[PDB]
Structure 1
Amino acid sequence: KVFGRCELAAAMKRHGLDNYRGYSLGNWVCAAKFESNFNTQATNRNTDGSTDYGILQINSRWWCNDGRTPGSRNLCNIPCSALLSSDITASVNCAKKIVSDGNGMNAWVAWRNRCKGTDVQAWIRGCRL
């Protein structure tokens, strides 16, 4: 599923991400835009052989099991394919674990390089929340 901007904001709002660990909703919408262009089915292979999955591009080296990242962890205790669903629940629940692990949203390279320190509130402007 390719979400619309305000549609995603509302779904993320409905799943507890607004101000989760102090990150306002616009931060999460901005991160999803530049990580996956709002597409739940996005995948990308990394040099080390791990793969990033879903709307927030969660990596198989630590967070999910895809059966082909030897020596990896599965800290969210899920198959990586669950992160490609049109239901974003699994992605949101895993993202909450990631952002709590000490490094905040710096775990998302696109957030660090394209959202951090910008007017992120613009990503939810005009939406009805």
Structure 2
Amino acid sequence: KVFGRCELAAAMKRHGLDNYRGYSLGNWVCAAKFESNFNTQATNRNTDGSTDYGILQINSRWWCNDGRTPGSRNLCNIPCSALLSSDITASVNCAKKIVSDGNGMNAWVAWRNRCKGTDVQAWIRGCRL
């Protein structure tokens, strides 16, 4: 599923991401835009052989099982395929764990490089939230 901007903002808000660990909704929307372009089916193979899955490009090294990332963990206790669903519940539940891991949203390199310090509120401009 390719979400609309305000559509994804509303889903993230409903799932309690708005100001989760002090990160405003625009941070989460910006992160999803540059990780997946709002596409739930996005996948990216990393150099280390792990894969990034779903709207927030959650990685198989620590967070989900794809059965092909040797020495990996499954800390969100989900198949990585669950992160590709049109329903973002699993992606959000797992992102809440990731962002609690101690580095906040710096865990998303695309958030650090493209969202951090910017006018993230622009990402929810115009939305009926």
Q: What TM-score does the superposition give when structure 2 sets the normalisation length?
A: 0.99
> 1:12: Cα distance to partner?
0.4
Aligned pair count? 129
Q: Give, in whole Å, the separation in 2 of the partners of 1:47 and 1:101.
A: 23
Q: What TM-score does the superposition give when structure 1 sets the normalisation length?
A: 0.99
**Which residue matches 2:56?**
56
Q: Give, in whole Å, the separation in 2 of the partners of 1:20 and 1:123.
A: 17
Deviations 1:67-112 (A, max 9, x none): 0001100000000000000000000000000000101000001100
Q: Give, in whole Å, the separation in 2 of the partners of 1:23 and 1:73.
A: 26
Q: Give, in whole Å, the separation in 1 of the partners of 2:3 and 2:31.
A: 13
> 1:54: Cα distance to partner?
0.3
Map residues 48-127 of structure 1 onto 2, 5 A cutoff: 48-127=48-127
Give the 4+ runs in structure 1 shifted more than 6 A. none
Q: Does the residue aligned with 1:8 lie in a helix, a strand or coil?
A: helix
Structure 1 gaps of 5+ residues are none
Q: Does the residue aligned with 1:68 lie in a helix, a strand or coil?
A: coil
Q: Give, in whole Å, the separation in 2 of the partners of 1:52 and 1:19.
A: 24
Q: Superposition RMSD on alpha carbons, in Å? A: 0.3
